[PDB]
Amino acid sequence: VLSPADKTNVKAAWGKVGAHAGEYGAEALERMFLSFPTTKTYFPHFDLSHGSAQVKGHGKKMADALTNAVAHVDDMPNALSALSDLHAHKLRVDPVNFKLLSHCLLVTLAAHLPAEFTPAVHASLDKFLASVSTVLTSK
Amino acid sequence: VLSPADKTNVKAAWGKVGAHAGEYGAEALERMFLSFPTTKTYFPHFDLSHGSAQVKGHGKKMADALTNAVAHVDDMPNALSALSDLHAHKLRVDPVNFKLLSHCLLVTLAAHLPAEFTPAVHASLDKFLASVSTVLTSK
Amino acid sequence: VHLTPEEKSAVTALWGKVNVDEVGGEALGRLLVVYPWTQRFFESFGDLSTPDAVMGNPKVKAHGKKVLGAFSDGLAHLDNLKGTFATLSELHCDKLHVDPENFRLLGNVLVCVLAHHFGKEFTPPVQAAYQKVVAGVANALAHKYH
Amino acid sequence: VHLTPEEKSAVTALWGKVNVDEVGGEALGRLLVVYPWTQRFFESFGDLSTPDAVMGNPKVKAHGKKVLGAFSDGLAHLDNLKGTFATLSELHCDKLHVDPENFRLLGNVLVCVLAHHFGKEFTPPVQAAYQKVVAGVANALAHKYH
Numbered sequence: 155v156l157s158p159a160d161k162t163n164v165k166a167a168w169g170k171v172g173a174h175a176g177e178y179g180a181e182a183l184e185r186m187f188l189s190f191p192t193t194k195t196y197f198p199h200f201d202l203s204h205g206s207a208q209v210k211g212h213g214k215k216m217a218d219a220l221t222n223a224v225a226h227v228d229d230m231p232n233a234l235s236a237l238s239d240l241h242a243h244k245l246r247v248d249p250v251n252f253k254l255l256s257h258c259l260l261v262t263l264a265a266h267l268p269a270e271f272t273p274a275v276h277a278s279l280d281k282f283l284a285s286v287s288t289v290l291t292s293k
Numbered sequence: 294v295l296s297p298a299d300k301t302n303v304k305a306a307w308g309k310v311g312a313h314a315g316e317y318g319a320e321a322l323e324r325m326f327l328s329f330p331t332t333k334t335y336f337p338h339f340d341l342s343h344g345s346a347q348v349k350g351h352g353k354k355m356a357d358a359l360t361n362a363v364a365h366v367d368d369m370p371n372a373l374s375a376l377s378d379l380h381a382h383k384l385r386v387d388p389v390n391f392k393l394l395s396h397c398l399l400v401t402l403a404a405h406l407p408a409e410f411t412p413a414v415h416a417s418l419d420k421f422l423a424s425v426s427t428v429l430t431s432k
Numbered sequence: 433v434h435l436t437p438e439e440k441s442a443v444t445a446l447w448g449k450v451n452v453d454e455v456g457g458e459a460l461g462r463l464l465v466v467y468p469w470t471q472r473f474f475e476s477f478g479d480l481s482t483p484d485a486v487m488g489n490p491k492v493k494a495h496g497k498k499v500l501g502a503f504s505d506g507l508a509h510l511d512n513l514k515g516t517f518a519t520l521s522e523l524h525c526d527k528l529h530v531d532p533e534n535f536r537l538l539g540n541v542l543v544c545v546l547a548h549h550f551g552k553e554f555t556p557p558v559q560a561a562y563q564k565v566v567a568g569v570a571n572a573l574a575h576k577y578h
Numbered sequence: 579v580h581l582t583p584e585e586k587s588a589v590t591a592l593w594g595k596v597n598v599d600e601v602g603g604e605a606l607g608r609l610l611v612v613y614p615w616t617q618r619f620f621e622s623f624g625d626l627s628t629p630d631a632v633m634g635n636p637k638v639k640a641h642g643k644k645v646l647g648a649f650s651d652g653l654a655h656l657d658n659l660k661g662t663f664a665t666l667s668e669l670h671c672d673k674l675h676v677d678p679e680n681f682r683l684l685g686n687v688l689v690c691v692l693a694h695h696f697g698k699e700f701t702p703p704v705q706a707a708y709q710k711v712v713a714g715v716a717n718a719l720a721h722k723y724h
């Protein structure tokens with residue numbers, strides 16, 4: 155499960171994410187695309203290069219789903235239910251990719267929140283992202 | 294989640310496991326020990342060689358916890374709660390090892406139940422074992 | 433990858449006994465069934481909506497034949513898997529974009545298939561030698577990713 | 579592993595800027611904190627009951643130094659990681675019994691550490707080149723497992 159300290163860490167770290175929410179999810183995706191090129195096949199219609207509004211807008215959609223999970227952290231399967239079907243049924247996203255994206259998110263968080271990315275928060279964000287991934291590959 | 298068809302598959306496949314329950318879990322462990330020798334460090338006090346009563350008895354304990362999960366398949370986290378703490382807190386079993394053991398279990402099931410190990414049951418047993426593993430590494 | 437004489441023995445023997453015409457289909461099939469995201473790469477094979485459909489699919493059995501040959505191949509060059517699979521690496525890496533973790537999943541589905549069809553014969557040491565092989569193929573196959 | 583001139587450039591430059599005396603401790607530390615089963619291998623280091631304790635542990639900072647050197651080493655031999663890590667392979671494989679997946683986890687914790695400490699500088703292409711490196715070290719380090 156997520157510990158209460160996990161919950162407070164995440165709510166806190168994401169609390170200082172702020173309006174950058176969209177910007178960050180876009181940068182996570184770019185980081186993933188560059189670092190793990192296999193992941194680009196799921197976006198063979200997006201523009202994936204730097205400055206892409208295609209990545210940025212989806213980066214926003216993704217970060218808003220995260221923020222939604224942060225708010226309903228105790229009922230994440232119900233919250234992320236519709237995205238579970240999306241990714242597993244229709245899109246057929248390989249579960250490996252969740253790990254790759256999760257790592258790039260941490261990297262992106264570590265790079266924008268020097269003070270908040272402590273070991274303990276790091277460990278919380280990891281448990282959190284692993285949890286989201288689990289719901290998204292649940293179906 | 295586990296589908297209802299998942300549930301009926303598993304209850305069925307495990308239903309024909311029978312008194313061999315202990316025998317099988319012991320053989321899964323041997324298969325794991327031989328195939329993935331790193332996993333032996335968690336048993337540096339057991340006798341791990343063939344014919345070992347040490348492996349066999351634990352093989353039984355493990356298979357009985359599985360059978361317990363099969364019965365409470367809808368409330369597995371509550372059911373497997375005490376083993377979650379055991380493996381994650383005190384024993385510190387690397388989550389990778391659950392995947393290795395799970396695969397050896399399937400192999401052991403496939404080898405003793407020619408008729409029951411259909412693709413669909415295979416897929417169910419996999420989802421099931423992955424679920425058990427998730428509870429056991431939850432803490 | 434280094435197999436021992438006995439491991440080579442265990443492997444080469446049981447492999448001879450393999451129906452090289454159906455085992456590949458059965459392995460590919462269970463991959464598509466057990467790990468449904470893999471279907472993504474095979475949408476051109478048509479009807480894959482139930483396991484029965486997937487298994488009874490000629491394109492799967494057909495392609496499974498080819499996969500099995502590749503393993504049989506790599507079995508010849510246990511000494512040199514890296515070079516054998518060099519071709520297949522580039523294809524899977526550069527054109528298909530299949531995550532290499534899937535190679536390991538196919539290898540283990542194959543081990544299960546062998547277990548199922550050979551039962552008792554597929555002893556734990558026999559399984560061990562085979563894990564060395566499928567791991568080796570996977571890594572060789574994953575080298576143009578490295 | 580083949581880095582490009584620019585990737586070599588990106589890497590070698592930012593690496594020069596690395597405080598080779600603390601980064602390793604911080605990476606090892608977060609490994610022990612983020613992935614608690616890894617502690618199992620380090621029970622001889624004493625107090626590891628909170629993250630504060632783990633990070634403030636001299637044996638961790640000490641050992642982290644050694645890990646960082648090994649990366650710095652492998653950085654010299656990007657052309658030959660396999661041979662460099664040959665020693666370290668046997669040890670981790672035959673004596674320690676550490677699952678190689680953990681090598682990948684350490685590599686990514688290192689990437690996070692770099693990200694944290696370098697912020698903006700750690701651009702996505704910079705991160706990319708570094709992923710090539712830590713992957714390469716992990717596989718080289720995992721070769722006596724293969």
Ligand code: HEM
Pocket residue numbers: 193196197212215216217219220237240241245247251252255286287290
């Ligand atoms: C943190 C994990 C993830 C979250 C929260 C997430 C969230 C979302 C959301 C909310 C959408 C709907 C976007 C929209 O309707 O405009 C979406 C779509 C999509 N996601 Fe994810 N996703 C995640 C992981 C992944 C991964 C790992 C991949 C592939 C490597 C992926 C690939 C896609 C694709 C291809 C779409 C279709 C978008 C479109 O058609 O415009 N997602 N995701």
Ligand code: HEM
Pocket residue numbers: 332335336351354355356358359376379380384386390391394425426429
């Ligand atoms: C299917 C997953 C697993 C199940 C259901 C399971 C079940 C159990 C149970 C019921 C016990 C208590 C035995 C007793 O009290 O006599 C136990 C202990 C133990 N398990 Fe597991 N286990 C699983 C996975 C693993 C894995 C993957 C490892 C290591 C690679 C492992 C290592 C151990 C160890 C070292 C003990 C201590 C036994 C003793 O001290 O006698 N377990 N397990």
Ligand code: HEM
Pocket residue numbers: 470471473474498499502503520524528530534535536538539569570573
């Ligand atoms: C694990 C060991 C594997 C081996 C030894 C192997 C081998 C092969 C072989 C021999 C072919 C025939 C190509 C040709 O002759 O034209 C092939 C093609 C193909 N492979 Fe695999 N493969 C493996 C794993 C996978 C996996 C896990 C996937 C997807 C999840 C995959 C996806 C494909 C696809 C879609 C093709 C046909 C594409 C085309 O013809 O353009 N392979 N592979």
Ligand code: HEM
Pocket residue numbers: 616617619620644645648649666670674676680681682684685715716719
């Ligand atoms: C990922 C890249 C890694 C590198 C480059 C690396 C490198 C090293 C080095 C340089 C040493 C010093 C040995 C000596 O000089 O005596 C060492 C020892 C050690 N390593 Fe690692 N290591 C890595 C990963 C890991 C991981 C993930 C674990 C455990 C989870 C681990 C467990 C240990 C332990 C317990 C020792 C000390 C044991 C002894 O001294 O007998 N290593 N490693």
